[PDB]
Amino acid sequence: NVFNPAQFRAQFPALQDAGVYLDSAATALKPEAVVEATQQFYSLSAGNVHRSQFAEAQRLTARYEAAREKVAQLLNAPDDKTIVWTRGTTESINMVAQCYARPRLQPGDEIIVSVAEHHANLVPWLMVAQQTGAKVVKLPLNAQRLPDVDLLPELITPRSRILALGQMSNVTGGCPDLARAITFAHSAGMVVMVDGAQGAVHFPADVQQLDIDFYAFSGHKLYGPTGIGVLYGKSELLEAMSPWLGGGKMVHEVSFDGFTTQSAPWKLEAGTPNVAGVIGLSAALEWLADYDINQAESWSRSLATLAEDALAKRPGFRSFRCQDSSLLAFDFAGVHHSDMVTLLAEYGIALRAGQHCAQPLLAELGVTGTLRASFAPYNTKSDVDALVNAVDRALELLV
Amino acid sequence: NVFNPAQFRAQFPALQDAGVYLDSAATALKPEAVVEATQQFYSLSAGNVHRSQFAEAQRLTARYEAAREKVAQLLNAPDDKTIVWTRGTTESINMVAQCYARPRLQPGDEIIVSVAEHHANLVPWLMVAQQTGAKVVKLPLNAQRLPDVDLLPELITPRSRILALGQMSNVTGGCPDLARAITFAHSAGMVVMVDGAQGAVHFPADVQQLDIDFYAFSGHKLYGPTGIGVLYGKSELLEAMSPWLGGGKMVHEVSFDGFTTQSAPWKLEAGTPNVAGVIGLSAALEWLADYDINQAESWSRSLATLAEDALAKRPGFRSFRCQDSSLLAFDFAGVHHSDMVTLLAEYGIALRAGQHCAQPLLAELGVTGTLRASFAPYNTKSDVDALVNAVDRALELLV
Numbered sequence: 132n133v134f135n136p137a138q139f140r141a142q143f144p145a146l147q148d149a150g151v152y153l154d155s156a157a158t159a160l161k162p163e164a165v166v167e168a169t170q171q172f173y174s175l176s177a178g179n180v181h182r183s184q185f186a187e188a189q190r191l192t193a194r195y196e197a198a199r200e201k202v203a204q205l206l207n208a209p210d211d212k213t214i215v216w217t218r219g220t221t222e223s224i225n226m227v228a229q230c231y232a233r234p235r236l237q238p239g240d241e242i243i244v245s246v247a248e249h250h251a252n253l254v255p256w257l258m259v260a261q262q263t264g265a266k267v268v269k270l271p272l273n274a275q276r277l278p279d280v281d282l283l284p285e286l287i288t289p290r291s292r293i294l295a296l297g298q299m300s301n302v303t304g305g306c307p308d309l310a311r312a313i314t315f316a317h318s319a320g321m322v323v324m325v326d327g328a329q330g331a332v333h334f335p336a337d338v339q340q341l342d343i344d345f346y347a348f349s350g351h352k353l354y355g356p357t358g359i360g361v362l363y364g365k366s367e368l369l370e371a372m373s374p375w376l377g378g379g380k381m382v383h384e385v386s387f388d389g390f391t392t393q394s395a396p397w398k399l400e401a402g403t404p405n406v407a408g409v410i411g412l413s414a415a416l417e418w419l420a421d422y423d424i425n426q427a428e429s430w431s432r433s434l435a436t437l438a439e440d441a442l443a444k445r446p447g448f449r450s451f452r453c454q455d456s457s458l459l460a461f462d463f464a465g466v467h468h469s470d471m472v473t474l475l476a477e478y479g480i481a482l483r484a485g486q487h488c489a490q491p492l493l494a495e496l497g498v499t500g501t502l503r504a505s506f507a508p509y510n511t512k513s514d515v516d517a518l519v520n521a522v523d524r525a526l527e528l529l530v
Numbered sequence: 531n532v533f534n535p536a537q538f539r540a541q542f543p544a545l546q547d548a549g550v551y552l553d554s555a556a557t558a559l560k561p562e563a564v565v566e567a568t569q570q571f572y573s574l575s576a577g578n579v580h581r582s583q584f585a586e587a588q589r590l591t592a593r594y595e596a597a598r599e600k601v602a603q604l605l606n607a608p609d610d611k612t613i614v615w616t617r618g619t620t621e622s623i624n625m626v627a628q629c630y631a632r633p634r635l636q637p638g639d640e641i642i643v644s645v646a647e648h649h650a651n652l653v654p655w656l657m658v659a660q661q662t663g664a665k666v667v668k669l670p671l672n673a674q675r676l677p678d679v680d681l682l683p684e685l686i687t688p689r690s691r692i693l694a695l696g697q698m699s700n701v702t703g704g705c706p707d708l709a710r711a712i713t714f715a716h717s718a719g720m721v722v723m724v725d726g727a728q729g730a731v732h733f734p735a736d737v738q739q740l741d742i743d744f745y746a747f748s749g750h751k752l753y754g755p756t757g758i759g760v761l762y763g764k765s766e767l768l769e770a771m772s773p774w775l776g777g778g779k780m781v782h783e784v785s786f787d788g789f790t791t792q793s794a795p796w797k798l799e800a801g802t803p804n805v806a807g808v809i810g811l812s813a814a815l816e817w818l819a820d821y822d823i824n825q826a827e828s829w830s831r832s833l834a835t836l837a838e839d840a841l842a843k844r845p846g847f848r849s850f851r852c853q854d855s856s857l858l859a860f861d862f863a864g865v866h867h868s869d870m871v872t873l874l875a876e877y878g879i880a881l882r883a884g885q886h887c888a889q890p891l892l893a894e895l896g897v898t899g900t901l902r903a904s905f906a907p908y909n910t911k912s913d914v915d916a917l918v919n920a921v922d923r924a925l926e927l928l929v
């Protein structure tokens with residue numbers, strides 16, 4: 132189970148054309164298993180007849196049927212009925228806000244949201260706050276740029292009901308002390324929405340050991356299809372939630388006088404699922420299971436380190452990176468980000484700049500945007516050199 | 531632009547393995563263009579670098595960027611910003627209920643829902659009725675099994691605010707007189723949710739000539755990806771709607787004090803889109819545009835006729851088919867549906883039985899379930915013979 136970066140790399144058909152692909156934290160390239168399972172799914176009938184490809188069809192069904200269990204295995208969830216399909220981390224969090232919090236929250240209740248949250252884990256709370264007369268309370272950063280979990284006892288009041296906290300920022304790659312935050316929140320009877328969109332990729336959460344109430348992530352960042360994500364909830368919480376969308380499949384009986392719902396997870400999954408997305412995510416998970424994530428992520432982090440140490444030698448560098456993360460957000464003094472993104476792309480280096488859906492974090496860091504190079508296990512030491520060499524030449528052209 | 535069934539048929543890689551595929555109204559097979567565009571999308575970087583497949587990458591971008599316009603062209607919508615991406619007809623209708631109706635509806639307002647509606651166009655109305663103290667009012671069927679649009683003046687009151695009406699039933703294939711219903715509803719100041727999940731496939735609605743307020747459909751029935759659908763709304767209505775999910779992309783500015791939203795359609799599209807679904811749907815639409823839908827649908831309907839006339843010669847047949855539809859729902863006296871589905875599948879015939887997410891319609895028809903064979907332009911006269919021959923033998927084994 133020894134991680135071999137060249138073995139991992141060989142599985143990604145896009146890699147040759149992609150150049151030096153350093154934007155995995157926006158979205159990941161896919162291994163051949165995800166490409167092939169999706170191609171089979173769309174190249175075969177989903178019906179009950181197979182005159183020549185029965186083997187391939189039985190595989191697809193087996194991938195679909197095992198898919199909740201593959202997510203449960205990634206999170207150490209105790210059973211697969213705690214896994215709910217969504218179209219992404221965004222939908223998952225809105226489902227918790229609307230189906231769990233909205234029916235419960237009273238005027239004046241408080242929702243503590245960290246300053247490092249992606250918009251996905253902030254906007255739905257501002258909305259449900261408006262809807263219920265509840266209030267969003269800021270969790271600030273500490274001096275090392277992580278949500279200040281030590282502040283929580285001071286910020287928790289009798290009115291505190293929900294904590295929304297990201298396991299890992301898509302800007303700094305920082306992870307707050309999540310075990311401690313959850314200990315403090317639970318002493319106060321609160322429930323915690325953990326945004327795992329980056330955390331599931333890099334440090335997938337053991338939701339039992341961490342006692343996580345709700346955990347959300349997206350397939351497309353976890354080497355997998357677009358349009359699919361997960362909500363994990365403790366079984367009692369999924370049971371406590373109101374239904375989400377209404378329609379087929381989430382009901383048992385329906386008449387003009389009312390309806391009876393399925394139990395979770397189906398209660399929360401109206402209409403035709405994104406079958407291609409569930410099958411491709413299952414394929415991504417089954418492919419990923421062959422790799423030790425600790426070794427893969429240590430490799431990715433080591434490349435970010437090489438890059439950050441090198442870039443730190445050039446005039447005007449600033450890094451926003453925390454905890455030797457695989458994600459390297461940075462700036463250069465006297466450089467327009469979009470110019471640098473474009474010049475890097477001419478050198479065959481794919482990365483991005485912008486606000487990263489993290490306006491309050493950036494405001495707090497005193498910037499309007501950052502460049503961000505993120506490293507994955509299909510990157511190499513030569514990708515780091517290519518990045519640094521391209522930056523040198525961009526600086527020469529721009530500064 | 532002469533329709534040629536053999537030309538249309540040749541485009542579907544699944545067909546050989548699929549046998550005689552008669553379940554298109556549950557979900558459609560895909561043409562090679564949708565398979566290939568999805569394979570390219572997942573086999574290439576979505577980033578800014580392409581060292582060898584720049585041509586393929588520019589195509590994918592062009593498919594994505596033209597995709598709203600391809601939907602607008604199918605519906606004769608006046609502009610592409612009236613097209614909103616969803617994960618399916620179900621989400622589209624819930625978005626209209628939650629974002630348009632819920633903020634407006636007062637205790638006692640009335641929502642008229644036809645007895646022929648799929649659950650997708652009934653459950654979200656029962657939910658928003660509960661939420662707002664509004665009431666769902668039944669639109670009954672006439673003697674020909676269509677929603678009784680002539681009854682509408684009698685059923686419309688001062689309190690009537692919304693009409694939910696299916697353009698085409700997924701059971702009977704029946705289409706109510708939609709122009710007239712919309713005339714009556716609009717005289718009353720009401721808005722109309724038109725469920726087009728089947729109608730977009732067979733008789734795609736001209737939303738201008740029909741003056742449709744909201745129209746919904748799903749990609750997977752329109753020869754296209756799972757996990758993608760459309761909401762069309764008149765521009766003033768999309769503007770009037772509250773935001774749907776909160777998160778990235780649907781906002782401009784976000785802080786702890788509030789947020790400003792994009793205008794429609796983006797206002798209503800939080801988080802990372804289902805990019806593979808948008809690109810594959812665009813590919814399905816561009817492929818479909820080469821065919822005259824009138825000729826294709828007349829061919830599909832002609833096969834359903836051949837099948838229904840033949841099956842009507844066997845003892846115990848009952849048909850639920852309306853208007854010589856491409857969809858043929860039926861029963862045989864003294865036959866357990868699931869037995870017949872299984873025996874047909876041994877003969878290589880793929881169809882299904884069940885409630886078709888239409889409990890109130892079935893209750894009204896006096897049945898618990900129907901078989902349903904649905905015909906598409908990739909079906910043939912020999913498929914009709916195969917179906918009839920298999921039924922004969924099933925009857926012999928079962929009755």
Ligand SMILES: *Cc1c(COP(=O)(O)O)cnc(C)c1O
Nearest residue numbers: 402403618619620648700727748
């Ligand atoms: C399929 C269907 C729906 C629901 O579509 P989903 O893709 O499952 O959201 C709604 N109405 C009719 C008439 C349908 O056939």
Ligand SMILES: *Cc1c(COP(=O)(O)O)cnc(C)c1O
Nearest residue numbers: 219220221249301328349801802
């Ligand atoms: C990507 C991301 C999201 C949102 O994911 P979608 O797939 O766009 O719904 C939320 N949080 C973090 C930390 C992310 O990186």
